Amino acid sequence: PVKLKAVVYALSPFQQKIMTGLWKDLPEKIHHKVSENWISATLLVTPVVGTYWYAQYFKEQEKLEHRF
Amino acid sequence: EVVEQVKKLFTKLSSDPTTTSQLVANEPASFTGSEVRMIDDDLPLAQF
């Protein structure tokens, strides 16, 4: 058992609004998600999309070069 | 005897005609479900 010192004040669940917080600070929520995550998102999307587009281009070039 | 002593000695009191009931009605008390936990592992006994 860890020895802890703290004071915790809590309000009853029936004295607070339950759902409005979903839509509060919404620009901050979007901004934090984008600014913290855009590198991770790039590192995930870029190789997949690039490989797919290159494969499509390869297939189109191969199809054209076999025609008459 | 006590009444005579009182009516002779208590002659400087304020005369404001305001009941306590009005003050209570003007600043009512209400109950809020809540808790405060003062955690201290060094105290030998817990009291709640």
Curated annotation (Swiss-Prot), chain A:
Main localization (coarse): mitochondrion
Compartments where located: Mitochondrion inner membrane
Biological processes, Gene Ontology terms: mitochondrial electron transport, ubiquinol to cytochrome c
UniProt GO cellular component terms: cytosol; mitochondrial inner membrane; mitochondrion; respiratory chain complex III
The organism's place on the tree of life at top rank: Eukaryota
Mitochondrial intermembrane membrane side: 55-68
Positions on the Mitochondrial matrix side per record topology: 1-37
InterPro entries linked to this entry: Cyt_b-c1_8-plants (IPR020101), Cyt_bc1_su8_sf (IPR036642)
Keyword field contains Cell wall biogenesis/degradation: no
Record-annotated membrane-spanning stretches: 38-54
Keywords: Electron transport, Membrane, Mitochondrion, Mitochondrion inner membrane, Respiratory chain, Transmembrane, Transmembrane helix, Transport, Ubiquinone
Topology of the protein relative to the lipid bilayer: Single-pass membrane protein
SUPFAM superfamilies reported in the protein's UniProt record: Ubiquinone-binding protein QP-C of cytochrome bc1 complex (Ubiquinol-cytochrome c reductase)
SUBUNIT field: Component of the ubiquinol-cytochrome c oxidoreductase (cytochrome b-c1 complex, complex III, CIII), a multisubunit enzyme composed of 10 subunits. The complex is composed of 3 respiratory subunits cytochrome b (MT-CYB), cytochrome c1 (CYC1-1 or CYC1-2) and Rieske protein (UCR1-1 or UCR1-2), 2 core protein subunits MPPalpha1 (or MPPalpha2) and MPPB, and 5 low-molecular weight protein subunits QCR7-1 (or QCR7-2), UCRQ-1 (or UCRQ-2), QCR9, UCRY and probably QCR6-1 (or QCR6-2).
Function text: Component of the ubiquinol-cytochrome c oxidoreductase, a multisubunit transmembrane complex that is part of the mitochondrial electron transport chain which drives oxidative phosphorylation.
Similarity annotation: Belongs to the UQCRQ/QCR8 family.
Protein name: Cytochrome b-c1 complex subunit 8-1, mitochondrial
Originating organism: Arabidopsis thaliana
UniProtKB/Swiss-Prot annotation, chain B:
Sections of the chain in a coiled coil: none
Name under which the protein is recorded: Probable mitochondrial-processing peptidase subunit beta, mitochondrial
Organism of provenance: Arabidopsis thaliana
Subunit structure comment from the entry: Heterodimer of an alpha subunit and a beta subunit subunits, forming the mitochondrial processing protease (MPP) in which the alpha subunit is involved in substrate recognition and binding and the beta subunit is the catalytic subunit. Component of the ubiquinol-cytochrome c oxidoreductase (cytochrome b-c1 complex, complex III, CIII), a multisubunit enzyme composed of 10 subunits.
Function: Catalytic subunit of the essential mitochondrial processing protease (MPP), which cleaves the mitochondrial sequence off newly imported precursors proteins. Preferentially, cleaves after an arginine at position P2. Component of the ubiquinol-cytochrome c oxidoreductase, a multisubunit transmembrane complex that is part of the mitochondrial electron transport chain which drives oxidative phosphorylation.
Localization per record: Mitochondrion; Mitochondrion inner membrane
Family affiliation: Belongs to the peptidase M16 family.
Superkingdom of origin: Eukaryota
Organism ancestry: Eukaryota, Viridiplantae, Streptophyta, Embryophyta, Tracheophyta
